[PDB]
Amino acid sequence: RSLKKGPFIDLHLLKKVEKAVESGDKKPLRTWSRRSTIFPNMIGLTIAVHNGRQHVPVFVTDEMVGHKLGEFAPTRTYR
Amino acid sequence: AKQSMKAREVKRVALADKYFAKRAELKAIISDVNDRWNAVLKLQTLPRDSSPSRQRNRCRQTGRPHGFLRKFGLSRIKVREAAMRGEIPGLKKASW
Amino acid sequence: NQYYGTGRRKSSAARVFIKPGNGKIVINQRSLEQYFGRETARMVVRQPLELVDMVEKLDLYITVKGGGISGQAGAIRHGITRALMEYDESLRSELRKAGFVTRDARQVERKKVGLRKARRRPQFSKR
Amino acid sequence: RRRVIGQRKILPDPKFGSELLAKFVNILMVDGKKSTAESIVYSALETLAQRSGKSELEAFEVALENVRPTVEVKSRRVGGSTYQVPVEVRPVRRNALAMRWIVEAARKRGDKSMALRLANELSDAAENKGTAVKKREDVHRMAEANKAFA
Amino acid sequence: RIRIRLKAFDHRLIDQATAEIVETAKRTGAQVRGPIPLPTRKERFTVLISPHVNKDARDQYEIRTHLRLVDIVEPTEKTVDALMRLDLAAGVDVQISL
Amino acid sequence: ARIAGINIPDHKHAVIALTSIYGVGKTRSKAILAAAGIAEDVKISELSEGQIDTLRDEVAKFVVEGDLRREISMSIKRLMDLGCYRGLRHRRGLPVRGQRTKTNARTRKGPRKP
RNA sequence: CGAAGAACCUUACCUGGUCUUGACAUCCACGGAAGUUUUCAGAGAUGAGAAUGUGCCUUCGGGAACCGUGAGACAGGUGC
RNA sequence: GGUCCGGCCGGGAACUCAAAGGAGACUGCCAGUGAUAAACUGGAGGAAGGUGGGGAUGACGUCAAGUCAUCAUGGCCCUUACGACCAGGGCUACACACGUGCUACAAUGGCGCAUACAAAGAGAAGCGACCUCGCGAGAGCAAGCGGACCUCAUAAAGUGCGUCGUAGUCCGGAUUGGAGUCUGCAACUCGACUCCAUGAAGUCGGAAUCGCUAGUAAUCGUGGAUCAGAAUGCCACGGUG
């Protein structure tokens, strides 16, 4: 929520969508700076995350708009 | 981190008024959220490592950054000697 | 013609002037009752001057620089005492005997390190 | 501890010039704030006189007779176990220690207001019915009795 | 009410100073102040000159550090010029910024 | 104003009555009491609709409880998911505020157990 | 706790990128004016381009302010 | 002495305030005490009294206790190494404690409008009013201020009139519905805080770790720096008591 008066990005990430958004049927993209907020032009693909024990795939189906990319990464065994 | 970064502060430390803090004095005032012009800000944030204010600082009488007391002008280990030549005028027998 | 004092007690900061005849108590532009209207000490300021028949003889005018009503009740004690202290040298024995000369100065040798009581040295009946 | 300095001097009540009515309130205070506690004690003494229509502050005594003890129990393990021997309280103590049992009865008493928790228990205390008087009579049942075991 | 904040390392050297300003400046106008103090810092000062690391030889000196206030009602040059001609006293300070 | 919703106040005086309505903002109630505006004691029945019907066209775009308790849960839908702002944390059914508050969801989403 | 800020943070450690005169700093050798500004890469260190610029003495000798590349000596840390 | 009711500005030095240089209380004479010793009480005389108090200097000796994490340095240290450059991450889980540190159990209480009085401290990597914008954190203009001038507190109780009726509530912010921003590459599975909607335990629990003797813990509040900066720590003097 501290994204305090409007949107931002990962600056290096969207710079690098640019061939894997060229006919979205393709293999995934990857990111390590999990803070990672993202444009609605990504809709149609797979984007995986450094959790960071391993690298877990998150999925840009039909709705993406509302939270940073951390919301599905399992960082250590939650007892 | 002992000496580290000094060179890269030095390389832009004197021109922050030229990366923003005078460059701003007409174009960037219409770019406020007080004055509304929404296409203008997105071209002046580009300067990244020299966006004012950001300063690694220099502990000087100490050779490596073991803090910096920004009230007194010396490292978080030095203090003892102030009491022994004049630098902290308030340092008598502690109140504790 | 006139006689005077000032005080320092919990935490004020008050003056007082004795004046010729009519017997009243005037704090800046108002009466005693307006300033301590519930404040249970109030008698103690007019008490030692009602002995010496004030009503046709003295008049009392006051002003104050940080109120402090619970402590003022002794700043005024000391002050009004300095005023009578040149009115009539006779009553220094009355002011003392009635406690009206005393002013806050004492702690009863209290704690510095841990012990409660801290001036008195080791005592025995032959060690 | 060789020097005589062992008790507070305090000043008299604002009306009847009595350190009696003054030590009452200054026992009742438990949280500080004096001058409004002193006006509420002054409200106790008027609610008192609603019973009788005269100087019931003279009957303050005729209750305080029953709350004053002669004896108190303090640290005396002398004889290889608890060996009490209370000793009497010096004359100056008889009625301050009675204020101590009037204020512990008032704390949870239950009466409408706190002016009435004190003015009712004084009324009872003259009746010997009282909860301040019951605590004293307990000590008399206890240590004034144990005179015969000392 | 222009506050000339007069200040010397010593009581000695501001006394020598101020008593001429309250004479010189006052001659035709403004009732010139000069004795009225500020929080005079009579402190205890300690420097390490010990010829080896041993116990003490941190010689505790005292100080005076004494400041006063020269005050004038108006910039009346036919009374005040004289203190400004006193520029030659390079051994006392004055801080006139107001 | 023909106030929709669920409950009604029960013979209590205005200044409790008004504020016991199951979703009409309490802190504001201090002032709207004079906007319609009515005495403090009235037991709300004697308002005969007509007395606050005097402010009706406001009330028809205000959140009075019917909205607040169901219809307001639709509101988040263009803000609801993974991406930028406000976000998938709400549609997940979780405790949304406090210290490591995902770990409070025990009761909310199934586990109960430590 | 020492941390009076264990998510740029005075880095323990998990990782990778890199080095072992490192980052800072001298004694001769051969040389140079110092810098402003913008474009594109790279996670950062670092990589590939484009413009504008050229000070003070002054024996035009020697160099300063101040940046290089080659040497031979050669740098460090709460380890108790 | 004038008021256009602001010490406003005329006007003079009681005295606080400010304070520089300083300066005065001694068994000092009186009642009793005993050895006309001894010193202990009450007092004349006071701003304290028999170190007057509150700070303070903490000698050899200090436990073979530390500061072995700036010590100042003898003996000995790792050196493909304990040497130095750089962006990432995750420290906080939870079944268990266990206590420090918190509170929240309704009238010696609060709740609502109205009335009376202080200050310790901080300030140009500053602090910032009036005054513009207000559901407000939070935007902004802009007089000012270098140490009684600018601003933060309009200390809490208390007083006077209203308001519940002993009531799981009106108070409980434990917390979770949605609604907001000051900072940032950066706080989210990591906060810090603002508006509404809330309502976990709630009801006076024993066994036994030592808080606290006097101006001393309840009771009644404020600051400060580390530092691109949120300790609930401590640290220090005030007072209803």
Instruction: Decide if E34 contacts E22 (C-beta within 8 A).
Output: yes
What DSSP state is assigned to residue A49?
E
For chain D, say whether C90 makes contact (Cβ under 8 Å): no
CA distance F74 to chain A (A): 15
Instruction: Decide if F44 contacts F14 (C-beta within 8 A).
Output: yes
Residue ranges of domains in chain B: 1-86
Residue linked to tokens 């960071």: A52
What does the alpha-carbon distance between residue F73 and residue F91 come to, in Å, rounded to a whole number?
10
What does the alpha-carbon distance between residue D44 and residue D53 come to, in Å, rounded to a whole number?
14
Q: Which residue is nearest to nucleotide H165 (CA to C1')?
A: D112
Q: For D68-83, b where at least 16 C-beta lie within 10 A, e where not — what string?
A: bbebeeeeeeeeeeee
Handedness of CA C88, C93, C95, C100 (dihedral sign): positive
Instruction: Decide if C48 contacts C97 (C-beta within 8 A).
Output: no
Nucleotide nearest to B56 (CA to C1'): H228
Alpha-carbon dihedral E47, E51, E56, E61, rounded to 10 degrees:
-30
Task: State which residues form the domain around F26.
Answer: 2-65
Nearest to B75 by CA among B62, B87, B85, B84: B62
Instruction: Decide if F41 contacts F47 (C-beta within 8 A).
Output: no
Alpha-carbon dihedral D34, D39, D44, D49, rounded to 10 degrees:
150
Gyration radius (Cα) of chain E, Å: 18
Residue linked to tokens 């290889």: D80
Which CA distances in Å does C68 have to A4, A66, C10, C64, D126? 48, 59, 7, 9, 41
What does the alpha-carbon distance between residue C115 and residue C92 come to, in Å, rounded to a whole number?
39
Which CA distances in Å does A49 have to A64, C59, D98, F32? 16, 89, 78, 52
Nearest to E28 by CA among E95, E83, E92, E88: E83
Contacts for E79 with CB less than 8 Å, ≥ 6 apart: E25, E26, E27, E28, E29, E30
Please list the residues that pair with E4 across neighbouring strands.
Answer: E70
Q: Which of B84, B89, B92 is facing E58, going by the closest CB pair?
A: B84
Contacts for C111 with CB less than 8 Å, ≥ 6 apart: C117, C118
Which CA distances in Å does B36 have to A76, B27, B31, B41, B46? 45, 12, 6, 10, 20
CA D89 to chain centre: 13
Residues of C in contact with D3 (CB under 8 A): 120
Which CA distances in Å does C2 have to B65, C7, C24, C25, D125? 69, 18, 15, 15, 55
For chain E positions 53-82, those within 8 Å of chain B (CB to CB) are 58
Tokens of A46: 């797979």
Q: Experimental method for this entry?
A: cryo-EM
Phi and psi at F93, nearest 5°, equal 65, 70
Q: How many helices (H) and strands (E) does chain C have?
A: 3, 5
What does the alpha-carbon distance between residue E88 and residue E94 come to, in Å, rounded to a whole number?
13
Tokens of C119: 């001036």
What does the alpha-carbon distance between residue B6 and residue B12 come to, in Å, rounded to a whole number?
11
What does the alpha-carbon distance between residue D86 and residue D139 come to, in Å, rounded to a whole number?
10
DSSP assignment of F59-96, as one string? HTTS-TTTTTTTGGGSTTGGG-SSSSSS-TTTTTT---
Instruction: Decide if F82 contacts A66 (C-beta within 8 A).
Output: yes
Instruction: Please name the chains neighbouring B, where neighbouring means 3+ C-beta pairs under 8 angstroms.
Output: E
- Domains observed in chain D: 19-146 (1.10.455.10)
Contacts for C23 with CB less than 8 Å, ≥ 6 apart: C54, C55, C56, C57, C58, C59
Residues of D in contact with C38 (CB under 8 A): 35-36, 39
CB contact under 8 A, E47 and B85: yes
CB contact under 8 A, D14 and C40: yes
Contacts for C83 with CB less than 8 Å, ≥ 6 apart: C3, C4, C5, C16, C17, C18
Which CA distances in Å does C114 have to B86, C110, C117, C118? 34, 10, 9, 9
Gyration radius (Cα) of chain C, Å: 19
Nearest to D96 by CA among D34, D32, D8, D4: D8
| Domain count across chain C | 1
Tokens of F107: 């009761």
Instruction: Decide if F44 contacts F7 (C-beta within 8 A).
Output: no
Tokens of A54: 């391993």
How many CB atoms lie under 10 A from the CB of residue F2? 9
Burial of C78 (0-12, 13-18, 19+ CB in 10 A): buried
Residues of E in contact with B92 (CB under 8 A): 44
Q: Which residue is nearest to nucleotide H70 (CA to C1')?
A: B77
For chain A, say whether F88 makes contact (Cβ under 8 Å): yes
Q: For E32-64, b where at least 16 C-beta lie within 10 A, e where not — what string?
A: bbbeeeeeeeeeeeeeeeeeeeeeeeeeeeeee
For chain E positions 3-42, those within 8 Å of chain B (CB to CB) are none
Burial of C83 (0-12, 13-18, 19+ CB in 10 A): buried
CB contact under 8 A, B84 and E43: no
Tokens of A31: 């990111």
What DSSP state is assigned to residue A28?
P
Handedness of CA D27, D33, D38, D41 (dihedral sign): negative
How many CB atoms lie under 10 A from the CB of residue F84? 21
User: Which residue in E has a C-alpha nearest to residue B88's C-alpha?
Assistant: E45
Nearest to D119 by CA among D30, D42, D53, D65: D42
Instruction: Decide if E57 contacts E49 (C-beta within 8 A).
Output: yes
Burial of E65 (0-12, 13-18, 19+ CB in 10 A): middle
Contacts for C107 with CB less than 8 Å, ≥ 6 apart: none
The sheet with strand C3-9 has its strands ordered as: C3-9, C12-18, C60-64, C25-27, C30-31
Residues of A in contact with F109 (CB under 8 A): none
3-state secondary structure F19-36: CCCCCCCHHHHHHHHHHC
Instruction: Decide if D47 contacts D60 (C-beta within 8 A).
Output: no
What does the alpha-carbon distance between residue F108 and residue F88 come to, in Å, rounded to a whole number?
16
CA atoms within 13 A on the CB side of E5: 7
Residues of D in contact with C117 (CB under 8 A): 1
Burial of D94 (0-12, 13-18, 19+ CB in 10 A): middle
Q: For B8-40, b where at least 16 C-beta lie within 10 A, e where not — what string?
A: ebeebeeebeebbeeeeeeeeeebeeeeeeeee
What does the alpha-carbon distance between residue E33 and residue E31 come to, in Å, rounded to a whole number?
7
CA A26 to chain centre: 16
Q: How many CB pairs under 8 A join B and E?
A: 11
For chain A, say whether F78 makes contact (Cβ under 8 Å): yes
Tokens of C94: 């009355």
Q: Which of C40, C43, C108 is facing D38, going by the closest CB pair?
A: C40
Task: State which residues form the domain around C72.
Answer: 1-127
Residues of F in contact with A79 (CB under 8 A): 114
Nucleotide nearest to C107 (CA to C1'): H53
Q: Which of C38, C70, C117 is facing D39, going by the closest CB pair?
A: C38
First and final C-alpha spacing in chain A: 26
Residues of F in contact with A7 (CB under 8 A): 84-85
B14 touches strand H (CB under 7 A): no
Strand G-proximal residues, CB under 7 Å?
A 12, 15-16, 32; B 1-4, 6-8, 14-15, 18, 46, 49, 64-67, 76-77
3-state secondary structure chain D: CCCCCCCCCCCCCCCCCCHHHHHHHHHHCCCCCHHHHHHHHHHHHHHHHCCCCCCHHHHHHHHHHHHCCCECCCCCCCCCCCCCCCCECCHHHCCHHHHHHHHHHHCCCCCCCHHHHHHHHHHHHHCCCCHHHHHHHHHHHHHHHHHHCC
Q: Which of A1, A65, A79 is facing F83, going by the closest CB pair?
A: A65
Q: Which of D2, D5, D34 is facing C108, going by the closest CB pair?
A: D5
User: Which residue in D has a C-alpha nearest to residue C125's C-alpha?
Assistant: D2
How many CB atoms lie under 10 A from the CB of residue E70? 22
Nearest to C85 by CA among C5, C6, C20, C22: C5
Q: Which of A6, A37, A65 is facing F79, going by the closest CB pair?
A: A65
CB contact under 8 A, F87 and A63: no
Tokens of F43: 């037991």
Instruction: Decide if A40 contacts A62 (C-beta within 8 A).
Output: no
**H-type alpha helices, chain E:** 11-24, 77-84
What does the alpha-carbon distance between residue E72 and residue E29 come to, in Å, rounded to a whole number?
9
CB contact under 8 A, A66 and F114: no
What does the alpha-carbon distance between residue B38 and residue A38 come to, in Å, rounded to a whole number?
20
Tokens of C121: 């040295």
- For E1-98, the fitting CATH number among 3.30.70.600, 3.30.2320.50, 3.40.50.460, 3.30.70.1400 is 3.30.70.600
Amino acid at F76: I
Tokens of B11: 């390389």
What does the alpha-carbon distance between residue B24 and residue B44 come to, in Å, rounded to a whole number?
9
DSSP assignment of E70-95, as one string? EEESS--HHHHHHHHGGGG-TTSB--
Angle formed by the axes of helices D131-139 and D96-106, to 10°?
Answer: 130
For chain B, say whether E45 makes contact (Cβ under 8 Å): yes
CA D137 to chain centre: 13
